[model samples]
Target chain A: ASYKVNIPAGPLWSNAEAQQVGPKIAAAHQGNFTGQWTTVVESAMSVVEVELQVENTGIHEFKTDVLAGPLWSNDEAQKLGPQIAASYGAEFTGQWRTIVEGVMSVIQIKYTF
Target chain B: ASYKVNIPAGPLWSNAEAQQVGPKIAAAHQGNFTGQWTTVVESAMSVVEVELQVENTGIHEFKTDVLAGPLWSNDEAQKLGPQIAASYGAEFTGQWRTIVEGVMSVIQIKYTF
Candidate 1:
């Protein structure tokens, strides 16, 4: 069947960067990952779209609970958060938590909408 | 050309989960999303890898501007940010933000590094 590719790659990526992500898409296009796989090949477009079709599409979308805070440094959190998320497959989705009233961290990214 | 899959699927997912994510990837696997896309299939490996080609392949990668702040409540923000990103297409990649002193939030996620 025909499919149009539409995954949010986030901001900061460029047209040049976009044009360079071909290999990743192809690898995930097979029947190996999940029952709900879709790929826009050859004639790819950036105005991507996605909707219902839930099953357990693994790999690409890093889904999990993220915990932040009470740490000695907030600066560390910047890197810590991403590293934490990156470690958990593909990541996004989040929630907020307060360890000590004034101190906070997002725990659910277990937590993006 | 042939491609290799190497996206970092975070911790806590099951082998069953790994077996599931086929559709989202296939959609981004086109010549459209970006020139750098790579998807895994049949022999899909949880250990995905990405490199470089660089181009504005378009769509999949949500590249743009994001900001959060001055909201009356932190709890309100938790929902706000993701909604903001989702409206912008797909979202992830965040940084810390602070509307008030000691009251911290991550931004630059222009803002996740």
Candidate 2:
């Protein structure tokens, strides 16, 4: 199964839609969410649609610092690393990815059972 | 010099902010504009800020189909090719680029003197 969420463009952390993403995924996957997401721009409004492969995989991934701005420097990325890992209940895998493209920057942290 | 425009996330084609981008560049550069755009996600709001190198270089470029959506197919790109070139009031160099990142999709078309 899968879950999808639409986020309107704006300050991601505080946006209603943005805030809903995590909880929605958690509930949809019954607390055993995967750390994978497929995102696409779905409207002229540049509405971001994020889809997940939902299963009780005991793996979790979440994105943070999503914003429209200049690319994040190494220091910024490093600083956010631990914070991201701490948010998930599972242990951090020491692997993460950063996406900087087309006026947006997002950091993804992975955790495993 | 350079000019920047912020486009809020939403349906782009009809957005007041999105629509202003082209004309703003033209005015800032005194009717001569380059299509070289440096876009970044600048705020937590995911506000897309697009920057352009403005000069009367006689070389122009513009972006179209800036939206939040799926990637454009080859057929869609081909169909818009002529329209984009025509809008510039110059000849199409037969060169264009597509950017599909995060949740945004944009097409940049190039024109020459």
Candidate 3:
């Protein structure tokens, strides 16, 4: 969602940079990357909030707090969440959450070690 | 460590900005901000690698891949690691790693929920 947007127009890190470093980061983790993925997004002229969660059975829980535009969508969160998790070799667990309209939207995905 | 260093003279997101957003981000997680805290640091002119770990007993394992200078030290990582975790209400676990001379050094600190 954010990668498709014009983040450079604003003053924040882009998903592109995240993508560039994702593999390097994963390599550093030695296939054990798990936890909170905190990063920012360009939100026009202002910043808003978006939350993502990946619940694991016995592995670890990963969370994220992304700043976005006020109109950020659940679909965006759902898509971005998996990309962030997969970069760490954490697969999706087939569970998902619908978007809620408000100051924040909680997007939960299941992840496995 | 990074805050005391001249990051602005180089290219990368400063620890200062991370500190500013850390509290706001912790608030967004509702005090459940556990996981990987990935961010960048300024090197003299190139990016080096640094690793930090927060191992918990019954909680999650937090990790980080910070791009730093070739001379990034364990002391800096130890100091910065806890500060990053503390912003999310995670406390240091009193265990620390010594700085090793190499292209990459892994700095670990124990953290609790």
Score residue B22 of candidate 2 by CA lDDT: 33
Give stretches of model 3 more than 4 Å off: A1-113, B1-74, B87-89, B94-101, B109-111
Q: Looking at every candidate separately, what fraction of the true A–B Cα contacts under 8 Å does it contain?
A: 0.10, 0.00, 0.00
Candidate 2 per-residue lDDT, tens place, A5-101, comes to 3322212233454344433333321232233222222221212333423222533333222111222565644543333222222223333333334
lDDT string, candidate 1, A36-95, tens digits: 222223332222232212123422222323323233354544434543343222243433
* Candidates sorted on TM-score, descending: 3, 1, 2
Per-residue alpha-carbon lDDT of candidate 1 for residues B15-54, written as tens digits (9 for 90 to 100): 4433433222222222111223222222222322322121
lDDT for B74 (candidate 1): 50
lDDT tens digits, residues A1-113, model 3? 01000011111255554343333333222222122233332231111121112222334333322221122455554544443233222343333442334443333322232
Candidate 2 residues lying further than 4 Å off, grouped into runs, are A1-113, B1-26, B29-71, B85-98, B101-103, B111-113
* Rank ordering of all candidates by lDDT, starting from the highest: 2, 1, 3
True-structure lDDT of candidate 1? 0.30
| Per-model DockQ | 0.07, 0.03, 0.04
In CAPRI terms, model 2 is classed as: incorrect
